[PDB]
Motif scaffolding. Structure first.
Motif, PDB file in Angstrom:
ATOM      1  N   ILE D  63       0.854  -1.181   0.000  1.00  0.00           N
ATOM      2  CA  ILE D  63       0.000   0.000   0.000  1.00  0.00           C
ATOM      3  C   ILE D  63       0.892   1.234   0.000  1.00  0.00           C
ATOM      4  N   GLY D  64       0.816   2.019  -1.073  1.00  0.00           N
ATOM      5  CA  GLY D  64       1.592   3.238  -1.188  1.00  0.00           C
ATOM      6  C   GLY D  64       3.089   3.016  -1.134  1.00  0.00           C
ATOM      7  N   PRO D  82      -0.893   4.823  -6.408  1.00  0.00           N
ATOM      8  CA  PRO D  82      -1.675   5.945  -6.944  1.00  0.00           C
ATOM      9  C   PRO D  82      -0.801   7.165  -7.185  1.00  0.00           C
ATOM     10  N   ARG D  84      -0.907  10.765  -5.852  1.00  0.00           N
ATOM     11  CA  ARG D  84      -1.490  11.751  -4.948  1.00  0.00           C
ATOM     12  C   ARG D  84      -0.427  12.542  -4.193  1.00  0.00           C
ATOM     13  N   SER D  85       0.819  12.523  -4.658  1.00  0.00           N
ATOM     14  CA  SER D  85       1.890  13.232  -3.975  1.00  0.00           C
ATOM     15  C   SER D  85       2.912  13.701  -4.999  1.00  0.00           C
ATOM     16  N   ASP D  88       5.682  10.941  -6.209  1.00  0.00           N
ATOM     17  CA  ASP D  88       5.376   9.803  -7.071  1.00  0.00           C
ATOM     18  C   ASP D  88       5.956   9.922  -8.478  1.00  0.00           C
ATOM     19  N   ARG D  91       9.574   8.764  -8.401  1.00  0.00           N
ATOM     20  CA  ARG D  91       9.741   7.336  -8.150  1.00  0.00           C
ATOM     21  C   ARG D  91       9.403   6.511  -9.384  1.00  0.00           C
ATOM     22  N   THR D 136      -6.473   2.808  -5.761  1.00  0.00           N
ATOM     23  CA  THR D 136      -6.178   2.946  -4.346  1.00  0.00           C
ATOM     24  C   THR D 136      -6.364   1.602  -3.644  1.00  0.00           C
ATOM     25  N   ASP D 137      -6.148   1.592  -2.327  1.00  0.00           N
ATOM     26  CA  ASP D 137      -6.340   0.369  -1.556  1.00  0.00           C
ATOM     27  C   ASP D 137      -7.796  -0.075  -1.531  1.00  0.00           C
ATOM     28  N   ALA D 154      -1.802   7.988   6.422  1.00  0.00           N
ATOM     29  CA  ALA D 154      -2.823   8.760   5.726  1.00  0.00           C
ATOM     30  C   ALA D 154      -4.081   7.955   5.423  1.00  0.00           C
ATOM     31  N   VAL D 155      -4.263   6.798   6.055  1.00  0.00           N
ATOM     32  CA  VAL D 155      -5.407   5.933   5.792  1.00  0.00           C
ATOM     33  C   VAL D 155      -6.070   5.577   7.114  1.00  0.00           C
ATOM     34  N   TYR D 247       7.054  16.628   7.149  1.00  0.00           N
ATOM     35  CA  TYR D 247       5.874  15.820   6.864  1.00  0.00           C
ATOM     36  C   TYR D 247       4.663  16.332   7.635  1.00  0.00           C
ATOM     37  N   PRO D 248       3.610  16.782   6.950  1.00  0.00           N
ATOM     38  CA  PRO D 248       2.372  17.155   7.646  1.00  0.00           C
ATOM     39  C   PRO D 248       1.507  15.943   7.955  1.00  0.00           C
ATOM     40  N   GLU D 249       0.876  15.972   9.129  1.00  0.00           N
ATOM     41  CA  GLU D 249       0.032  14.876   9.586  1.00  0.00           C
ATOM     42  C   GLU D 249      -1.229  15.435  10.230  1.00  0.00           C
TER      43      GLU D 249
HETATM   44  N1  LIG Z   1      -5.947   5.761  -0.097  1.00  0.00           N
HETATM   45  C1  LIG Z   1      -4.582   5.433  -0.466  1.00  0.00           C
HETATM   46  N2  LIG Z   1      -4.276   4.215  -0.888  1.00  0.00           N
HETATM   47  C2  LIG Z   1      -3.035   3.895  -1.230  1.00  0.00           C
HETATM   48  N3  LIG Z   1      -2.059   4.786  -1.161  1.00  0.00           N
HETATM   49  C3  LIG Z   1      -2.295   6.039  -0.744  1.00  0.00           C
HETATM   50  C4  LIG Z   1      -3.571   6.404  -0.381  1.00  0.00           C
HETATM   51  N4  LIG Z   1      -3.536   7.692  -0.007  1.00  0.00           N
HETATM   52  C5  LIG Z   1      -2.288   8.117  -0.130  1.00  0.00           C
HETATM   53  N5  LIG Z   1      -1.529   7.129  -0.574  1.00  0.00           N
HETATM   54  C6  LIG Z   1      -0.116   7.210  -0.832  1.00  0.00           C
HETATM   55  O1  LIG Z   1       0.671   7.630   0.523  1.00  0.00           O
HETATM   56  C7  LIG Z   1       1.686   8.327   0.179  1.00  0.00           C
HETATM   57  C8  LIG Z   1       1.714   9.664   0.989  1.00  0.00           C
HETATM   58  O2  LIG Z   1       1.121  10.667   0.214  1.00  0.00           O
HETATM   59  P1  LIG Z   1      -0.135  11.520   0.857  1.00  0.00           P
HETATM   60  O3  LIG Z   1      -1.395  11.220   0.083  1.00  0.00           O
HETATM   61  O4  LIG Z   1      -0.325  11.122   2.300  1.00  0.00           O
HETATM   62  O5  LIG Z   1       0.191  13.134   0.772  1.00  0.00           O
HETATM   63  P2  LIG Z   1       1.546  13.814   1.418  1.00  0.00           P
HETATM   64  O6  LIG Z   1       1.207  15.166   1.996  1.00  0.00           O
HETATM   65  O7  LIG Z   1       2.591  13.976   0.341  1.00  0.00           O
HETATM   66  O8  LIG Z   1       2.124  12.827   2.606  1.00  0.00           O
HETATM   67  P3  LIG Z   1       1.671  12.935   4.187  1.00  0.00           P
HETATM   68  O9  LIG Z   1       0.300  13.560   4.276  1.00  0.00           O
HETATM   69  O10 LIG Z   1       1.635  11.554   4.797  1.00  0.00           O
HETATM   70  O11 LIG Z   1       2.664  13.791   4.934  1.00  0.00           O
HETATM   71  C9  LIG Z   1       1.526   8.624  -1.345  1.00  0.00           C
HETATM   72  O12 LIG Z   1       2.446   7.920  -2.057  1.00  0.00           O
HETATM   73  C10 LIG Z   1       0.129   8.154  -1.692  1.00  0.00           C
HETATM   74  O13 LIG Z   1       0.105   7.600  -3.093  1.00  0.00           O
END
Ligand SMILES: Nc1ncnc2c1ncn2[C@@H]1O[C@H](COP(=O)(O)OP(=O)(O)OP(=O)(O)O)[C@@H](O)[C@H]1O
Ligand SMILES: Nc1nc2c(ncn2[C@@H]2O[C@H](COP(=O)(O)OP(=O)(O)OP(=O)(O)O)[C@@H](O)[C@H]2O)c(=O)[nH]1
Ligand SMILES: Nc1nc2c(ncn2[C@@H]2O[C@H](COP(=O)(O)OP(=O)(O)OP(=O)(O)O)[C@@H](O)[C@H]2O)c(=O)[nH]1
Ligand SMILES: Nc1nc2c(ncn2[C@@H]2O[C@H](COP(=O)(O)OP(=O)(O)OP(=O)(O)O)[C@@H](O)[C@H]2O)c(=O)[nH]1
Ligand SMILES: Nc1ncnc2c1ncn2[C@@H]1O[C@H](COP(=O)(O)OP(=O)(O)OP(=O)(O)O)[C@@H](O)[C@H]1O
Ligand SMILES: Nc1ncnc2c1ncn2[C@@H]1O[C@H](COP(=O)(O)OP(=O)(O)OP(=O)(O)O)[C@@H](O)[C@H]1O
Ligand SMILES: [Zn+2]
Ligand SMILES: [Zn+2]
Ligand SMILES: [Zn+2]
Lengths: 266, 471, 471, 468
Positions: D63-64, D82, D84-85, D88, D91, D136-137, D154-155, D247-249
């Motif tokens: 996953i991710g 996916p 979403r960052s 990606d 990579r 996605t997952d 993030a899940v 890293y924002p959380e």
């Molecule tokens: N629902 C999901 N399923 C699978 N992978 C996901 C999912 N959501 C995010 N990811 C992956 O997790 C990784 C972290 O990216 P994220 O979406 O969290 O945004 P970010 O701001 O860059 O990171 P973070 O918020 O953790 O600091 C990415 O590679 C993303 O593809």
């Protein structure tokens, strides 16, 4: 290097290319101690120690004094003969620089006033009536090589007898000779003198004892009986090269001399 | 490959020489007890370094040089030798005598060419010869590409450089003292490492400086003079004393060699210039200047000096011809002394305490077997003046710690005026830079004149007779 | 595999270099006593690392570089160099002279192509060639893959990167000084490890900073003032001194290279890019930027700096041109000194007491129950200012313990006014990060700027003559 | 079978790392001066332990994840990647370059199949493939046996696990930071062993914390404000800093991974799940979760954490933007330091006296010159906070003995609550919290849309155009 012990007897191979004189190996006292193979002569290693420092500067300034241990190599001999052979060769090597430092120490610093060192003077490098003279630049004994600076003379400077023995180790034998070593005991001058005096052979040479002892037998045999026996001495026989082998050897008063020296002499 | 210098084998200056020239190896060899041995060793090594980085088979212009020094060199030299000095005749006669004695004993040194060159010039003074001439820097008309200056303080730097660049010179070098003390408008100073003292014309009758002389007196309560005075300020005349030799210099020409980093030369033709420092050792510097044709970049008019040792400038009180006055004195301090003084200047110290501690840090007794010797780090005669400077510096820094001001504002009130504090000591620590404001744009260089033959018939006859032999 | 550096064999900086580059083996050999030897060793090793990381047979662009440095290399370089600095004519002449001196001695490199490339450009200046060009960063028309910025401070980071990106560039590098001090709005600062000092233009006449120069005054009570001040804030002009060389700089262009972690470049085309730090050693950093087409993710506009050494910023009182003012300075402190300084900072300590312990702590430290020398000493000329800063920090931390407040509330006094406590120092201990707000969205890149040549006839003729030497 | 880690040969982290993994032998080898070396060594060893434990005949879901680091692996991996960052695109480009470069040389790890599979997804970006996926997952429709999470925050955890369960997943793993500090509702904290600091946005302008930045130009009186806040409570947004990376959380998603021992999942199908902790080392934990169909037993809703070293939480006073406030912080303390302060804490101690004792115990201890405490056991920038906490803790313990009360009774006047400023958990102590253990929310976040751009597709295809 490695030391092999074939069935009790000990023989040493001279494979290291370090400083070697004649057929004798030179190694540091610390190396001998840190080896269970050389445990038979560990007593000599302790004795040659307490004489190894690295100099000093200041009010009390000295020079580095390094000692080494001499062992025979290349021949398969008994372990007992290994002990005595090392002692004789090692002692000569340590004796030579002890005098050398004493002469070098006088040159740099000031000779003591209430002593006998005034017999040593500083002499111009040109007027050198001394046949052998000690130099300071290379800290050896040399005949005529234009020693720069100002040359030292002295009492022992005239005959360099300490220097006359350093080259002797080049021709020093290592393998003991097998022969029926018999001896006469008791206070000398009764029959043992007469063995070499009245019933000595043709090919024997009177080289034993002090130079006076060498000559007395020659005068004794000629005046009493004859037989034209010549006279050399132990010091000349040991230092100078040898000649035609003696038929039967009648050395007298050799028990004053060291056993290891006799082993090489025979 | 070893380089031999005329320095004593036990001198402490040998260590400083090696660190300044790490591409060589230095071995001392003394043949004469000259009083300025240290000042000549540096000059000898500087010439060797320059010749190692100059392209071969290229002609070189040497301004104001004695021709007897560049005889055995394998390079090509063009010597400019005016006759406006009081020791020129000796140099010319020595050059002729040594040249004649060298004929027929050296295989390949162009001795025959030098002999022919000298004879041709003596016949016609105005002639131009590849290896000799009697013009000035602005009068010589021989083209080259490299120019070398050595201990020259009698020319204007911008004017002289422009005339060299017209002929097509793209590289220059300068060897001499340090100009920084004169940029601070000092009255007297000293270079202790080279036994050099310099002073102003008006303080030659002082009592406690490096170069002075006075006499005893009883003191009278009355004496009249026609000059009111009431103003003691530096003048344009300065006396130099290197070892036992005297040299008169001028302030205007000395300050002209403190060139900026980038400057422009504007005239009939335009050029862009730079300036760098390659070697610095306790007062001596070596400078390199590059010249290009055109007009590029921008100028800022700033000069930067890097201090490896301490630099001091303080105010002292002394009696000049019986009258008490005050002026300023500058000097250099070794780096090791400065580092060990950091602890005690955190408090207030009297001059007596500073003097005693400096003496203890300086002198040591060294024993070598039975011999005894005394060793010093710096000259003892500069300790009293240095001790005064540290005392004043430690007091001025403390006062800044109680009168703390607000951040971002200037205090200016009963009347709209700001008070100016007093300063008595300027101290530059090691690894610290100083910046000055200078001029970077040069426009006028027109200095027309007429050339006059600077020679005499009696001298001409003597040279011709000396250069008269069958070899 | 071994790498040679022009550093003294007994310097203490060799240990730091080995720690920063664990993949190499560095050993010293000295040929020149340069005053900025430490600043050149880092640059030499940085280029070696960058070349190894990237694959061969890739085209590389150099933004304002000296072509002579890349003459002996295997990679394909494209040198972009306008004529905008006074050193440009000197660099071009050196390149031509060195190129013609190895025409028939080196066969591995593309020597013949470079010589023909130079001649073609000299004919007409508007020619694009694989090796040489005379355009700017926004005027070149050569497509490549990698761009390198080495000690470049005169460009705008967003605008320059965008023009490189639209030509198909995926990777970039930057080598230079740390820009953290300039985000704190400091007035002066220093980098002790590289003998670098910088100061604002308005305080060039100070007395107790690394870059200043003043003179002696007796004090004049009250002075005339045509204009009024009352404002003392940093301006856009900053001067740099790297050992012995002067460099003017600008604040706006300096602060543009402190990029955030993620930002978007949106114009005619859109890209998403990042920024990372790979190497850091006491002031020098190496940055890596990777671009990619399209828009992805979300931005936050924060920048993070990691401190492996102590960072200090205090407020000091000095005298500028005879007048007392106050301003802020910043510096770096070794980590070992900071760790050993923790014990006494729990109480109130006077500046004099702190200075004495710093001097003593500069000679001996305790490690693993044993004792040794520091071997990581700090410069002595900055100890006084550091000692005062520590005293203020200790005092401020004791007033917060005596003013305990309730949890979850924020006292306010319709308007609501709350008091602001006083802070006079900022101290960043080792293993601590700083976070700041910057801009992360750029769209305005429209710069319709034309181009013009900067060469001249006299310089062009000289280059042709130098290249005419076929042997 | 030795394992090589990218850390220094004289680091003190070797002893802790070897003790946490007694089934291996750790050998150091440094090739890069990275600022987060400790954080990467733990993750490298964690994967090695997981791989050998599982059956090598099953299918693993990621996953991710980054497919670049899963190339040289003998197992079967289905990467869910996916877009979403901002990381990606980099990579994906690196994966394509490595695949083409290593084609035809290492013909053992199924390189040709991966190359062909990647090309198929590029042509039609909606197909499901054994090796690569672009959903996605939740939207993925691949069936496997094992699912692996690595540094995923993030899940939502109950929702993600349920969607994996209905596809026939019976085992899961999770590697990441400890979530205990966020259950105590702290404002700032630190992980000193790994050079990690985190803080809230409302205290980003502090003066004496690990992640802050303040100003100097100040000294005035009176700041007019329109809103009357009077409130300092933690908010959702939290910022992390590992080395020199940000890293924002969010707090809500971080607290969802603090699962209880037993919980039920209800919906179309029913499952029972259990959570267990395997490896713990100064902040990182490894959790194993198993799923089984049906309903069994009863739940209690409790979470238990075991402390091997000291855990501390106190209250501090600082200035934010010039205004004095108060909030709480937390940190970790080595066990050896805690044991040696037992006798000192028997009475009341001044904070300055405690600070001096801590300094001597840390960097001025010696036994024989062999081991000592490596002259640095706890980092020096957290000592002032620790010294303050011990002083307050000792003072509050003495007041308890002076208010002795009766057995089995309570007094109401209607009762008074005392004040607490320090929570201290000594080694060999456990903490218990109350959480939720029954989940039945079947939300459907199903809004599927691709995130692949035309220029990115062209670049990926072009890199694979040439077979070398
Ligand atoms: N629902 C999901 N399923 C699978 N992978 C996901 C999912 N959501 C995010 N990811 C992956 O997790 C990784 C972290 O990216 P994220 O979406 O969290 O945004 P970010 O701001 O860059 O990171 P973070 O918020 O953790 O600091 C990415 O590679 C993303 O593809
Ligand atoms: N201030 C100043 N110093 C000079 C000058 N010329 C030489 N010096 C310095 O004086 C030092 C010693 O002078 P010398 O080397 O003996 O000069 P010389 O060339 O041998 O010939 P003489 O001048 O006759 O002694 C030199 O090293 C110079 O640094 C000058 O014109 N002005
Ligand atoms: N602030 C600033 N520093 C620079 C610049 N250029 C170089 N530096 C740094 O200053 C040092 C001086 O470099 P040098 O030793 O003179 O060698 P060089 O750069 O090849 O030649 P120069 O043109 O003389 O600078 C360099 O190593 C750089 O680290 C600049 O433009 N601005
Ligand atoms: N709080 C948080 N930590 C993360 C995240 N991703 C990785 N980390 C941690 O950051 C530590 C340092 O690794 P990085 O410097 O990011 O480099 P990398 O993990 O090898 O690869 P990249 O993700 O491309 O940077 C890792 O050990 C992770 O534990 C995240 O999304 N959030
Ligand atoms: N304009 C010049 N161009 C070239 N050489 C010059 C020039 N002026 C002087 N020289 C030479 O340099 C040296 C300095 O001459 P100068 O007139 O300064 O002698 P001086 O009276 O002793 O003054 P000073 O001590 O300052 O040198 C002389 O040898 C001279 O030949
Ligand atoms: N827009 C640009 N694109 C590419 N190179 C540039 C650009 N501007 C300047 N340069 C190069 O920078 C180098 C030196 O910087 P600059 O031109 O600003 O000289 P400077 O006036 O001394 O200022 P600085 O101190 O910043 O170097 C020059 O060689 C120049 O070619
Ligand atoms: Zn001429
Ligand atoms: Zn171009
Ligand atoms: Zn999938």
């Amino acid at each position: 290097g490695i030391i092999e012990t074939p069935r009790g007897a000990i023989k040493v191979t001279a494979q290291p290319t370090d400083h070697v004189v004649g057929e004798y190996l030179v190694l540091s006292p610390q190396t001998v101690l840190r080896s269970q193979k050389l445990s038979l002569i560990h007593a000599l290693a302790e004795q040659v120690k307490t004489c190894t420092h690295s100099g000093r500067a200041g009010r009390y300034a000295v020079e580095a004094y390094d000692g080494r241990v001499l062992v025979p190599s290349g021949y398969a001999i008994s372990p007992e003969d290994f002990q005595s052979l090392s002692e004789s060769a090692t002692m000569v090597y340590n004796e030579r620089e002890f005098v050398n430092r004493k002469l070098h120490h006088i040159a740099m610093h000031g000779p003591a006033l209430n002593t006998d060192e005034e017999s040593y003077e500083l002499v111009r490098a040109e007027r050198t009536e001394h046949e052998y003279v000690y130099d300071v630049d290379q800290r050896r004994c040399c005949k005529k090589e234009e020693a720069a600076g100002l040359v030292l003379v002295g009492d022992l400077t005239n005959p360099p007898y300490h220097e006359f023995a350093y080259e002797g180790l080049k021709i020093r034998p290592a393998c003991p000779y097998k022969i029926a070593v018999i001896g006469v005991f008791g206070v000398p001058g009764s029959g043992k003198s007469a063995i070499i005096k009245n019933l000595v052979t043709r090919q024997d040479l009177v080289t034993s004892g002090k130079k006076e002892n060498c000559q007395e037998i020659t005068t004794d045999v000629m005046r009493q009986r004859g037989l034209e026996i010549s006279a050399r001495t132990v010091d000349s026989l040991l230092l100078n090269g040898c000649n035609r082998p003696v038929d039967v050897l009648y050395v007298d008063e050799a028990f004053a001399c060291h056993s290891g020296t006799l082993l090489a002499l025979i | 490959d070893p380089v031999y210098v005329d320095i004593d084998a036990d001198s402490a200056f040998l260590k400083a020489l090696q660190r300044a020239y790490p591409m060589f190896e230095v071995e001392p060899r003394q043949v004469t007890p000259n009083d300025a041995a240290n000042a000549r060793a540096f000059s000898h090594l500087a010439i060797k370094l320059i010749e190692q980085e100059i392209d071969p088979d290229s002609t070189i212009l040497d301004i104001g040089s004695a021709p007897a020094r560049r005889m055995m060199s394998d390079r090509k030299y063009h010597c400019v030798c005016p006759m406006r000095s009081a020791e020129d005749p000796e140099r010319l006669a020595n050059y002729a005598r040594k040249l004649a004695s060298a004929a027929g004993k050296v295989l390949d040194r162009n001795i025959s060419g030098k002999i022919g060159d000298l004879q041709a010039v003596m016949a016609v003074p105005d002639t131009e010869t590849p290896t000799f001439c009697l013009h000035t820097d602005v009068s010589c008309r021989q083209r080259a590409d490299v120019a070398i200056y050595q201990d020259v303080y009698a020319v204007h730097a911008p004017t002289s450089l422009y005339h060299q660049a017209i002929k097509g010179v793209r590289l220059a070098y300068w060897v001499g003292f340090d100009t920084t003390p004169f940029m601070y408008n000092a009255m007297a100073g000293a270079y202790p490492s080279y036994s050099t003292n310099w002073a102003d014309e008006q303080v030659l009758k002082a009592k406690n400086i490096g170069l002075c002389s006075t006499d005893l007196t009883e003191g009278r309560r009355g004496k009249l003079s026609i000059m009111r005075g009431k103003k003691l300020e530096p003048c344009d005349r300065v006396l130099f004393s290197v070892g036992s030799t005297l040299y008169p210099e001028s302030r205007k020409l000395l300050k002209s060699w403190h060139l900026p980093s980038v400057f422009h030369l504007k005239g009939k033709l335009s050029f862009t210039c730079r300036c760098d420092t390659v070697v610095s050792c306790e007062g001596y510097v070596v400078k390199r200047i590059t010249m290009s044709p055109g007009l590029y970049g921008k100028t800022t008019g700033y000069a930067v000096t890097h201090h490896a040792d301490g630099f001091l400038m303080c105010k002292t009180t002394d009696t000049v011809d019986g009258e008490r006055v005050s002026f300023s004195v500058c000097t250099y301090v070794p780096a090791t002394i400065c580092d060990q003084m950091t602890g005690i200047l955190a408090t207030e110290v009297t001059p007596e305490d500073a003097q005693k501690l400096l003496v203890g840090l300086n002198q040591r007794i060294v024993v070598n077997g039975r011999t005894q010797r005394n060793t010093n780090t710096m000259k003892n005669y500069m300790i009293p003046v240095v001790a005064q400077a540290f005392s004043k510096w430690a007091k001025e820094c403390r006062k800044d710690m109680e009168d703390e001001k607000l951040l971002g504002v200037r205090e200016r009130t009963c009347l709209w005026a700001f008070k100016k504090q007093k300063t008595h000591t300027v101290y530059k620590r090691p690894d610290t830079q100083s910046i000055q404001k200078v001029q970077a744009e040069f426009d006028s260089f027109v200095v027309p004149s007429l050339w006059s033959s600077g020679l005499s018939i009696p001298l001409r006859t003597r040279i011709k007779w000396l250069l008269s032999k069958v070899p």
